[PDB]
Design a protein around this ligand. Sequence first.
Ligand code: SF4
Length: 260
Amino acid sequence: ILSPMERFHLKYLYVTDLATQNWCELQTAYGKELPGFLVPVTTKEDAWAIKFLNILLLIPTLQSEGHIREFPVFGEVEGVLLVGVIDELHYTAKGELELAELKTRRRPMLPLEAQKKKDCFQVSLYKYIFDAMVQGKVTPASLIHHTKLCLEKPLGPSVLRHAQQGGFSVKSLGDLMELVFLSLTLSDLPVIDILKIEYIHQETATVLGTEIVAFKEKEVRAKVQHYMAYWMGHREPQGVDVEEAWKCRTCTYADICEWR
DNA sequence: TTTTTTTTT
Ligand code: SF4
């Protein structure tokens, strides 16, 4: 009678949350039900204000220096707000906007095909959200409705300090959101042309493989439509296929999972 | 709710 978002008290979701769902949807569900395993700010209007201030600083950096790291992304995807952080964004020598996702491994082994499908899906989500932000499909009203940010509340001295040191003078969280929308959509920010995953050995720094994700919008949209169907409560969570039963060996919830 | 990172007889 209650959806998983309501039962787990989740106002939105993380990008990796849907990536774990590609690994095993039921394992992601148990991770939210039983969490016992798995700038100074004590409020959510400031925490989102800091995220906005970083966006307003990384947009001009990317458009001049041509290389930024830790770029926040957010947006509503089939009824659920999705939040994430892109690791790297830079312009190639040819002029393409590339997304670099570095994945370090302790053992020099090639990544499993099951691991790469989870990783290919994660960066595709990053592009799915990024393309929507820079094209005007992510509005401040869309953010308020899902996060329940109170714009009437003033931002604390923690943020106004971090803002005046950056040269910008914030008055309200509302004025900050309107500049973020304008800067994202009116600064010639192109779509992401290349999605590149790289697997690196932690010690020897050996390249364990390079993945250039073949992005297909209709395929990506279809999967999150299916994945969000669980979170909104329109279907029951599903475990791994019988072929991937080796995942249940290293799963924390193997001794309570009735799928197994 | 500050997102994610990384798996493994
Ligand atoms: S035991 Fe297997 S099916 Fe059950 S949650 Fe873990 S990985 Fe998924």
